[PDB]
A paper describes a structure:
The SARS-CoV-2 translates its genome into polyproteins that must be cleaved to release individual proteins essential for replication of the virus. Given that Mpro processes the majority of these sites, any intervention that stops this process, such as an inhibitor, would block viral growth. The crystal structures of inactive SARS-CoV-2 Mpro, with the catalytic Cys145 mutated to Ala, with 9 substrate and 6 product complexes were determined to sub-2.5 Å resolution. As in previous apo and inhibitor-bound crystal structures, Mpro crystallized as a homodimer.
Six additional cocrystal structures of Mpro bound to the product (cleaved N-terminal side of the substrate peptide) were also determined and comparatively analyzed. Our cocrystal structures captured the N-terminal product after the cleavage reaction was complete where no covalent bond exists with the catalytic cysteine. The N-terminal products carboxyl terminus is coordinated by the catalytic dyad. All 6 cleaved substrates bound at the N-terminal side of the active site superimposed very well, defining a “product envelope”. There were no major rearrangements or shifts in the backbone and except minor side chain conformers, the products bound similarly to the noncleaved substrates. The nsp5-nsp6 cleavage site with the P2 Phe was once again the outlier. Overall, the product envelope recapitulated the consensus volume revealed by the substrate envelope for the N-terminal part of the Mpro active site.
Residue numbers in the entry:
A (entry chain A): 1 to 305
B (entry chain B): 1 to 306
C (entry chain D), D (entry chain C): -6 to -1
Write the structure that this text describes.
Amino acid sequence: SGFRKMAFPSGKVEGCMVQVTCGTTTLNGLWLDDVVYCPRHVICTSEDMLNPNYEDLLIRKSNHNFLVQAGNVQLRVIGHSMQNCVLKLKVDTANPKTPKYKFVRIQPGQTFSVLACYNGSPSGVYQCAMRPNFTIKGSFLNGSAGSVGFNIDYDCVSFCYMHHMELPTGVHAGTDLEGNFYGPFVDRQTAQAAGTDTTITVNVLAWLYAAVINGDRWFLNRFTTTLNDFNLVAMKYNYEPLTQDHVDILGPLSAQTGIAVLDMCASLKELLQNGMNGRTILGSALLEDEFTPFDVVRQCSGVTF
Amino acid sequence: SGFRKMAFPSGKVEGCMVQVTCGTTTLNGLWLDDVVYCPRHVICTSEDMLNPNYEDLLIRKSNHNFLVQAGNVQLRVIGHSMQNCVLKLKVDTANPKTPKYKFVRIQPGQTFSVLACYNGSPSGVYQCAMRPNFTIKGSFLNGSAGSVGFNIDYDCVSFCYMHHMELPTGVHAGTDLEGNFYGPFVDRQTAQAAGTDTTITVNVLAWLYAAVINGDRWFLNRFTTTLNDFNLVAMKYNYEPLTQDHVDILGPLSAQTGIAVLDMCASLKELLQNGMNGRTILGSALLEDEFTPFDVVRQCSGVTFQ
Amino acid sequence: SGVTFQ
Amino acid sequence: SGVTFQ
């Protein structure tokens, strides 16, 4: 019993983190096979960042301008190139700790674990969701760029996020591992803001199922609803529309608890219109939306890696 | 910026996890140098769960009755002994992945990371606190016993908890790595129940300081309080007493933010009186108590967002 | 209700 | 407003 915000075990990723320094700037890189991946703004001075021309900045750099440290071993850089907003530094040694991995681009509402690192050294791990506005509500300080987010499937690490920057509201923006930004953000020092966010409806439903699995049932009720009627309420409360695919994804939890998705939707509708009336669910006074249906199944059935 | 329930990276502990089987019972063990540590109830049978005599159960076992598997490799047990409620299985190979480590017994209010494991393999990592009633609010299923809790400040793993069992309310009980239970609990399936739990006041105050560091002050007020009057009020909400030691521990956060500790105590008194009136603090609508003062300094910037 | 070993 | 590159 119990339900916690649970991250994937991070050992497979820890063995891939390195420190990358270019000039005065130090951040982290991801060492896989014989390539180190890192944010391209490592080549920028603060003055460069106002209107950087990255192609121009990189021309001036040679291989020895990139100092790459794996533990207390300096890696020899033998090539450098740029893919979108990440740099690829070819090194002369393949990482012997390279796990089975792939690069994946996730969708809003999907969750992942963040391995926060400074100076190439892992410092903490936590579970994040990609928000509908494509920010992540991370915990990051200066020097954390190049930290990565990931999921695991059996023995394969799926890398989905590399951290680049912080927005003025204190939320975070980054890229996939091919250097493509999540969200309408650019790696430039200029005015940028996250747009209005919404709540990830299918994840809230998943967490209500987790609550039922754990014995919290006070929000269950005799009513059901329809997708169209529920989505009129969702729109009103700045919740993402529920789709038929979302309903299908919840079906396991739906049968495991004997509560149909549209039955649970009638609970969520009532909670949105009336609140929780002083009560809590799984120790929260807010409706939690950073657990996916698969996160719930994985935790509640003890899936291992 | 930001503030998350942040665990330590788990790899150093992942490399120590093994599976231990005795008879039909399997749980996890912790392989450090040439010793595997695990809960002694692995030697129970379905008829040894209310009043096992573990001395008698163990004398009937040989070394080869313990099946220890590290990944796909069987370890050879060459000796065994019991220390309080843990078994120590001597094996003929030192774990080449043993990290720098120590064993520490923690006090209520302290936090730690848990690597939840099944069959010697990791399921996930999360943050926990030792509650004032010596339980932890974990996420654990059958087969999770032998999972451990730890911190990794600096480069050294401090092991502080090994999981044994689940109480009727769904919370969890276990031991330090010398096998002494936290709290009044025993490894018997007899009826046991945790004392009333309370809120960890010093940690709530730390988290309010974290909120100020990250830029929010809306919950402050112009008042102060004596320590005595604060405790008289907070205990009416089932908060633990705040001691002068706790006040001293909050000194660095008080200095970084310019908010005296007893002034933060006055803010907490008003929050308990008022609730949050539709607002949130660091993403929560409740007052959070599983971050310590040390945790806040670990995670937060040293520069306050004034 | 009794304790449950895990 | 102003971004911070970390």
